[PDB]
Structures are given as structure tokens and as C-alpha cells.
Amino acid sequence: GRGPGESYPDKKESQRFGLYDSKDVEEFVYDYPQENGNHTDTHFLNIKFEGAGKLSIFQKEKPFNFKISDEYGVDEAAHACDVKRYGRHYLRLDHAIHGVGSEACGPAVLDQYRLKAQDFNFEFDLAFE
Amino acid sequence: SCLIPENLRNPKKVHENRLPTRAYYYDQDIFESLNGPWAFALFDAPLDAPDAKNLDWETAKKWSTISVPSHWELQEDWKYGKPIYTNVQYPIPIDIPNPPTVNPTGVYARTFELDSKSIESFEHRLRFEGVDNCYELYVNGQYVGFNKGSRNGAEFDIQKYVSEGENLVVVKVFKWSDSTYIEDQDQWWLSGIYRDVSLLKLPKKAHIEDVRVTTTFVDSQYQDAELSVKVDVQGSSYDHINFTLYEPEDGSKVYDASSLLNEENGNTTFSTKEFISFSTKKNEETAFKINVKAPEHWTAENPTLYKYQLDLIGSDGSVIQSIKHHVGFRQVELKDGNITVNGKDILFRGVNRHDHHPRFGRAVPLDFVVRDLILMKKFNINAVRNSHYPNHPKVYDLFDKLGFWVIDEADLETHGVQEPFNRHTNLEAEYPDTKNKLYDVNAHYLSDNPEYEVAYLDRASQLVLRDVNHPSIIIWSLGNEACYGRNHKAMYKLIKQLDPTRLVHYEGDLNALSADIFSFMYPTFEIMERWRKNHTDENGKFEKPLILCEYGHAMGNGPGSLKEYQELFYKEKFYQGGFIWEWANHGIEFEDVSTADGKLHKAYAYGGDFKEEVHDGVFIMDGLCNSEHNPTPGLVEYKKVIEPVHIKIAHGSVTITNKHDFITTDHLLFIDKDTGKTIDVPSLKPEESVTIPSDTTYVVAVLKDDAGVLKAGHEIAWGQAELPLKVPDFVTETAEKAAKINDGKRYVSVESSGLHFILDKLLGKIESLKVKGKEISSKFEGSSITFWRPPTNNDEPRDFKNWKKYNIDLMKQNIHGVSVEKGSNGSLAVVTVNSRISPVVFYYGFETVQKYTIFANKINLNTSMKLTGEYQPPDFPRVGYEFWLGDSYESFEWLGRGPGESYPDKKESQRFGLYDSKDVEEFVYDYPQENGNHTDTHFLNIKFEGAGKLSIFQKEKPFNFKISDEYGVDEAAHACDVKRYGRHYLRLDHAIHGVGSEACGPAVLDQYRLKAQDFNFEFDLAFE
Ligand SMILES: [Mn+3]
Ligand SMILES: [Mn+3]
């Protein structure tokens, strides 16, 4: 999918398609903790488990969104060092995500990038090697 | 300690309510299998397990099931844990006699049906063939008893407890107990009901409980013998016993897995070729002694058996119970200082065999055990040691029928008491002649601990009384590596009282104060020889002989020098052979993640793979056969060194010597391989020989007819005349061809019709050598001459440490001068390269001269290597060139040793001949290491598609070579971790280090070590 860095509906085109390895990427730390680390237009995702190979994950007929991390208490952490961390990782596996825009000072997320309220229908496969 | 149940920490609680041990006989009419799915639940410790006095079947019905027999660490998805491998160290803390408080407890439950007639007609028992570590037994919510001794059997009387209809059996199995301390064999820790469970239905009013059969020769010429049959009948309602001995079936009898394992049957007429009949009289002793006229001897080389039928008979003259078994006429003695069978001082051609299966562990299907023994017979083995416990009871008929000298061994090992001592004193080495003083220090914990006497005696009593009637068993062993103490003396007294007919072995007893035999493990020849001399008096008499209960450690590439051990065996009557360690690798099949692939592959696990806190790594993989129980080059070599016929070809003569203990050569067909016609060889008795004039080079000894489990045409022995090194008749093109020589700043070119030679002068590297469509180039990393090999298991403890310490893996070639001159005597050009080959960090290295004399169809490579500098290594792994083969490469062919690999001290089984790489399945080691070398190679032809062959030969001496695909061998944990290039290479070697057995045993012997020295050798690269 898109990489090596994060990508969002209206902030993704610099992140070209390719095969990416989490080991090759320094994930970006925001000076003010907030939504980060999503990967949009993901074709498939392989999660490697020690001594047991991979779990492959893919969404049917459309690319998906994902985030793999450690972190929580992000909403209320004032600075990077205030971010809390679990004793294990999680996968945030997403059908869709709201765009990013520039509304702090400027236009709202444009229409075509907004995650409008609607029915959701999506199929995932959890394929184990 | 009230958090540990009393029976799991009482050395004296060997059992509760177990019946006395009796001779084992399987009877289809009496035995009813309770194998299959059982309700099963696993608990953290005894205190979490339910009270079995209150466990309903209605409750247990709801549990998951496990299949009996099986270990609970070997289930689908590792549901109840994984195997643990320790060698010496205990996997628990030492606090004798306490087990750990957290003690995995498995509760088994199942039901069985009982008839109205059944309870009236029969005595009901439960027989458990093996349960690890110990268990209490319940029937219909009532405690029956308790038992310890994992590899021993147990019977319990069940009559009081059984009801008409459904009956509930509940077994509580515990992983650890005070018994753990004496069950410390170098093997996998595995738990559960891993052997058969049976319901026995014996005739109620009277039945046969036990039988003793002995055969003693009446005479010093071993002709007439006394057959003694003593029967223990239980109950009043019988008249007498009948006994029928049948005419013998010769040991050459043909068997297969099906006929060996056939268990039938009730209406089956055992035999009808009557030989002797005896009847007892009413109210008289149910025993007798018979004189037997010159019976056929039972021997491991010829396992001749007399079938017999013993009948218990009632008042109405009807048959109450029958035993159908066999008699083997054989007598073992200690005679004039030797282990003697039928007067003959025998030679052990042996192995240690553990119970192991790569998927089922110690729960080995009989089918698989048969497989083992057929393979043993196919490879000239004549003896097995039951390391280190009795096997499944049905196995011993297999030994009886196929013919093996058997050491049946008590389930008793104490090794772990030494580990803290070894570490605290920083002990580096143990030697067979002195190590007993180290074990003496800790004997008081167990083997010299009075609290354990009952346990130790029980292991002896159980060992002997179950298996007393098998002619194949000639020696009882008191256990293994358990130190030496009073308990061993007690075991010896008991075994001699129980069974005076056999001899007693115990290696932990150096001076055999309570053994009949001396025994060493992994001894040096010097140590063997010291012992021999100190135990042979001035007259030449010895009181007891020496065997090697363990020797020639078969771990990985090896063992080296089996030859030298064998020469010693044949030279001295005092030595009576040995049992190599071990039969097969203990690998457990599992899914591995590949280091080469990143993908999941089938592999064979050793210590560490199941993530044990403490383990002993790759020492699991120490067999002549791999984890799948298939032959390695170890087994192939062993078969040759122990071959029971010697065939020596020299000076127009074939000398054949019979090296059997008993049998003649009559069963053997001798073929002159050079002509295909057979050779008339006179019938040779043991030790007899014959010289026959012949022009032959190669003679084979082969089986005339199917006999035992061997097929007609099976090779038993062979010999070859030594083969002089002949220079191939290759015609070097010495005609004058115009050749363009381009000596550039860095690169030197030599071009001629059909020839292209490019050398990098900076590196000493051949960039490309293409002659007549055939291309090679140097496989270059630092040096054009390399020295490293992926360390074998034997290399690891010492030689590897040295080679790494001296940076032999980082040897560099530093070019000093390159000389380029026009061709002289038919030559196109001469390129001479002067360099120092030396590793980083170090002074030592070789002042090297490489002279490339280039002809149109040949390249002569002269190598001169002068060893210079201070602080040198003692030896090298290897020395030679590495070449990439061109894309055209398809296969190879060689004149030399084959078809398999060969090494300086592991080569003689690989006879000389012309071999084709296409005919050979190259051996894959369970643990990746040095492999695939071919020693004593006369010439090597490398075939390139569409361009013929490149012939390679070394001047005046045979050479070594390996052609492969592989790398990352040093660090690959399993076969699937081995990486592969997109092209093949040739490893072309002047010399190679021997292999030895140093992982556990002697270092590579002097004459096989690749000592640090000057190297001078010349190769020709001849292009067709
Ligand atoms: Mn802060
Ligand atoms: Mn691996």
C-alpha cells in the first residue's frame, strides 16, 4: 500500500505504493499528541509473529486503513512524553477514516474526504500462514 | 510439607497394592485393550485435581478427550505444554526427596462394560505398561492403588471393585515425585499414560500366574541340555499341567513386520511338529526338569527357537489356560574372564537404543520398533543396550526372533546430582579411569542413601521378573550414571538371587565390586590399554572383561575412528566390543520459521526450540540414524567397520577371514565384481581364513537367500585392492596458437581461440575463465584460497574454538606482485601471483605463489604456501579453492570414494568406483554442518550443458571436493534454515581436517588432523 510514512484521505499522495516493512520506518512523533500512524489505501497487511510466520489481512474489493501501535491516553497527553503505553500492541483495522483538512485555521475537510454518516458494509479475511 | 501429597515425596512408597511382577506373556483371550479416547483434564498441582472418590462419569463425560497411549506434551497445538530436553541437569530444584509444589497433574477417566457371566467366570486386573511419572488408580470411586516406575509395568487386582454394567476407571497421573530423582536419563521429559492399558480376564478358580524357563547345558562340550520349566499356579481347581516342546525352527527363518507382530489367536493351532511331551501328576509339583538331546543352539547370529505350549488342565481334562511361547537353548557364563555364550567369548557389535519416535515420543508403535531392528540387522549390528530402561514388554520377542545380544537395563539414572558439583568446581573433563572419584562425592544423596534402597530394589526386581524368559537377554544392567553406593550392592545381591542365569552390568561401578563385567564409556585407546594391563596378571589371565557400553558418539558428522576402536577389539580377547551411542536422533517434528525463507517449514526440534528455561541444545541429535530413524553416513560407516567377514585383496590374492562368533560363511555368495562370476569359497568356521589366487580388484560377500529380515543379494561384507592414482590420458594442446595478452593497470587478459582468462591483479581473483563454452570464476571473499568449514558438532567444543580464536574464517589474500610472461613450452602464457594469505589481527600466514600456466585447452595451477610468522594455530579445517560454476553447469561425475560423503577418519565404507551425482541422494543433516566432501578423489568431471566436461585432477595425490548450492550453514538451526545461491560452486581442496568424536569422546586422532604446515599442490583444469 502507501508508505513508508502515514497517510490520510486528503494527505496521501506523497506516500507512493510499494511493499513496506515496519522495521525500515521511523514512525513520526508529533510535538502535540494526536491522531497518527494510519496507512490508507492498504492492499494487504502481514503481521509477523515470532516462530509462527504471518497473519495476512485483506479487505474485499477495496483497499483499507490500518494502524499498529502501543499507545493510548493520546487525547489528553499534552506532550510526546505524556503518551501512555500498553504492555502489548494492538491493530486498529479500519474500513474508512475521516480526512484531515486544515480547519484549525482554514477550510474544513473537503466533501469528498469526509467520512459521512451512512451504512457500512465490508468484508475482511484473516488468513493464517 | 502438607502442600505436597505424602506419596509424591516418599522414596519408600514405590507402589500401593501392585501385584508381584511376573513373566510377561501376551494372550489375546486374556488381554482386552483399554486404549483409545479417555476423558482428560490437566491441573496445576495435586490440590486442584478433584477427589476421585467423588468423581462421576457424568462429570468426567464433559471433559475434553486425550488418546491413550500418548504423552501430554505431544498433542495437537501443544495443548498441554511442550517437551523439555535436559541432559545431565535436573529440570527441578534439588531438595531430596521433594518434588516441586507446582506439579502438573493429569486426571484420566473412561468406562468399560462388564457382564453377569464375566464377574463369575474371571479374575479381573488392570495392567498399565507405562505411565510417567507416577499415578494413583481408582475404580468405581474406590482407591485401588499407587505406582512408581515410569518404564516398568504394573498390575492391580480389580475384582473387589467391579460391578455389572458400566465401570469407571480414573487415573491420577503426576509429572514429578521423589521418583524423578532416579529418572534423570539424557532424553526428553514427557508425561502421561504413554504405553498400553489393558483389562485382564484370568480364569477364576485356577490360572497360571508365572513361568520360569531355563536352559543349562549339562556338559563342557555344550551338547545335551537340561530344560527347566517351573510354573506358579494360583488356585485349587486344577489337576495338572501338560507341556509340549515342538521341533525347532532354524534362525534363518523369514520374517516381516506383519508376521513378527501377528498376535493371533484362540482357535489357532500353535504347532503340531511334536518333539517332547511331559505331563504332571495330580497333587504334584507343577514344575519339571527334562533332558534334551543335543538341541539346536540359540545365538544372535542364528536365533533358533523351539516353540512350546504349556497347558493348565482341570479335573474333567479340559484346558483351563494355555501359554504359547518359545525356548532358546543358550547359556551365558563368566568363563576364564570372558562373557561367554555357549562357551564362546562373543563380540558385541552394538548400539544403545532409546524409545523414540519423532511425533509420538516414547509412545512408540511396535511397527516402528520393528523398523528399527530390521535396519539394525541390515547394517551388521548384533546387539542392543536398552538405554536406559526396559522397553515395551512385546519388544523382547522381537529380539528373541531376530537375534540380538541384549542388555536389559533398570530404569534408574541419577546423573543430575553431579551438575552443581561440576559447575562449582569448574570441572572441564571426566575420564573413564578416574571419574568415579567425582561421583563418589555425591553418591550419599541417592545411590548411597538408605531411604532409596526400596526404590532401587524395586527397579531391579521389576526389570528382571518381567523379562526373565527371553534368550536374547544375556545381561542385566543396574541402571546408568547413578554414582556408586550400597543400593547398587543390594540390587546385585537381589538380581543374582532372582536370576542366577545371567550376568550383571553397571558402568558406575568402576571396579565391578557388585558387577560381573568391566565397562567404559567413550574411552581413549590409552585408557583402555592401561585398564587391560592393570587387570591382566603375569600369566595373561583376567578375571573380568571390558565392554564399551557407550562409545563412538554418533552426533552429527561422525563418528571418526570407528576403525581404530575395531582394530583394538579384534586384537585383545579382553575387549569384547561395544555399543555406540546412539541409535537415532531424538528430534521432535515441529513447525519452524525459516531463517532463509521467512516462511514456515517442517523441522526437527532439539533443546531450545520448545523454549525451556534450562536445556542442553543439540545433544538431542546424537544418533547413527536421523530423527526420522533413517541411516546417516555414521550408520553406513559403522556397518563397514563391524562387517563379520574380512576380505583383503593384495598380491594376486584374496584373503577371506570369518569374523562371526558362531556361524559359518556357507550362507554367503562371494562375487568377483570385476568379472561378475562367483568365487568358490570353502566353508569357513569362526576365525578360519583362506587365501585364493585371483586377478580381482573388488570382491563382494552377499546373502544367498532371504533369511531373517534380510533379502537375497544383501551385502554383508566387501573388499577392494588399493587403487593406484593414474593420471588421465588428457591431451594438452601444446601446438602454437596466437594469443593476445593484455596486462592492464588492474586486470590481466589472456585471449586465444576458445579461451578467455581474466585475473584481477589487485585481488588475486579470477574474474572469468571461459574455455570451450565452459566457464568458472573464483568464489571470492577476501581470499582465493580458503580454510573454513561450517563447524561439525564434534568441531564445536575445541577445534572450532581454536579456529575462531585464530580468525581462520577471516583469512585475507594480500597481493604483493603479479608477473605476466608469454608462453614457453606449448604454453600460451604464464601468470604468476605472489601474495600473503593471512587473517586480520594476526602475524601468521602463508607466503604464497600461484603459478597459472595457460594452455589452449588446459590450465595448470601450481600452489606454493609457506607458513610464516609467530602465534600460529595448531590445525586448519580445510585448505583449497572455491569456484563459481557457469550457468551451463548441470551435473558431475568422479573417480574416487562414494557414493556418499567421506572424511579422513570416516571414509572406508565409501568404496572406490566411478560415481555420478545424479545417482546420489545427498545427505541432509538434522543439524546443518560440514557435509558433502569426497575424499581420496582421483579425478572430477564437471558437466556443462552443450559443452561437455571440465576434468580436474591433482598431481601425485588424490584430493578433496564438494559441489553445492548452500551457505549460511554455520548459523542455520535446522535444514530449512540453509540458504541457497542462484548458482553452484566447487570447493576444491588439497586437504581437510578429520571428524573425530570430540562432542563426547576423543579428539580427531593425530594422523587425521590437518596440522599447520607448508602446503604445496598442483591442479590441472582440463577442458574437453
Ligand atoms: Mn506534558
Ligand atoms: Mn530453524
* Residue-by-residue DSSP string for B397-414: HHHHHHT-EEEEE-S-B-
Strand partners, B757: B750, B769
Q: What is the dihedral of CA B1002, B1003, B1006, B1010, to 10 degrees?
A: 160
The answer to whether the peptide bond before residue B523 is cis (omega within 30 degrees of 0) is: no
Residues of B in contact with A52 (CB under 8 A): 591, 593, 600
- 3-state secondary structure labels for all residues of B884-932: EECCCEEEEEEEEECCCCCECCECCCCCEEEEEHHHCCCCCCCCCCCCC
How far is B901 from B962, CA to CA, in rounded Å?
A: 9
Contact status of A104 with chain B (Cβ, < 8 Å): no
* B248: number of Cβ within 10 Å: 21
B16 phi/psi in degrees, rounded to 5: -135, 120
The CA distance from B908 to B923, in Å, is: 17
Cα–chain-centroid distance for residue B518? 22
Domains B331-642 and B732-1024 share a fold: no
Chain position carrying cell 465401570: B167
Among residues B550, B775, B930, B998, the one annotated as catalytic is B550
| Ramachandran bin of A106, using left for φ above 0, alpha for ψ from -120 to 50, beta for the remaining angles | left
State which residue of chain A sits closest to B77, comparing Cα positions: A52
b/e per residue B800-832 (b: at least 16 CB within 10 A): beebeebbbbbbbbebeebebeebeeebbbbbe
Are the beta carbons of B363 and B69 closer than 8 angstroms? yes
Compute the distance between CA of residue B308 and CA of residue B301 in angstroms, rounded to an integer: 22
Which DSSP category does B13 fall into? -
Helix (H) or strand (E) holding B436: helix B436-440
CA B528 to chain centre: 22
**The domain over range B643-731 is classified in CATH as 3.40.50.2300:** no
By C-alpha distance, which of B877, B738, B725, B904 is closest to B808?
Answer: B877
Task: Tell me if the domain spanning B205-330 has CATH number 3.40.50.300.
Answer: no
Ligand nearest to the CA of A73: 1
C-alpha cell at B742: 593484455
Cα angle value B411/B416/B420 (rounded, 5°): 170
- Say whether residue A51 is in contact with chain B using an 8 A CB cutoff: yes
A123 and chain B in contact, CB less than 8 A: no
Resolution, given in Å to one decimal, reads 2.8
Q: Please provide residue B429's backbone torsions phi and psi, each rounded to the nearest 5 degrees.
A: -150, 145
- Interface check for B600 against chain A (CB to CB < 8 A): the answer is yes
Domain ranges across chain B: 1-204, 205-330, 331-642, 643-731, 732-1024
Cell of B971: 548459523
Which CATH superfamily does the domain covering B331-642 fall into?
Answer: Glycosidases (3.20.20.80)
DSSP state at residue B19: P
- Is the domain defined by B1-204 classed in CATH 3.90.1750.10? no
User: Contact B888/B865 with Cβ under 8 angstroms?
Assistant: no
Cell of A1: 500500500
| Phi, psi dihedral angles at B253 (to 5 degrees) | -55, 140
In this structure, the dihedral spanned by the alpha carbons of residues A83, A88, A89 and A90, taken in order and rounded to 10 degrees, is -100
Residues of A in contact with B593 (CB under 8 A): 50-53
C-beta of residue B446 within 8 angstroms of C-beta of residue B452: yes
Q: What is the distance in A from the centroid of ligand 1 to the CA of A105?
A: 24
Write out the DSSP string of A36-68. Answer: ---EEEES-EEEEETTTEEEEEEESSS-EEEEE
State the Cα–Cα distance between residues A122 and B936, nearest whole angstrom: 68
Q: Residue B656 phi/psi, 5° resolution?
A: -115, 125
Nearest to B300 by CA among B177, B217, B399: B399
Nearest CA in chain A to B599: A53
Bridge partners of residue B145, in order along the sequence: B137
Q: Is B453 considered catalytic here?
A: no
Residue A81 has a CB neighbour count (10 Å cut-off) of 8
CATH no., domain B732-1024 = 2.70.98.10
Cα separation, B302 vs B456, in Å, equals: 35
User: Do residues B326 and B214 lie in contact, with contact meaning Cβ atoms separated by under 8 Å?
Assistant: no
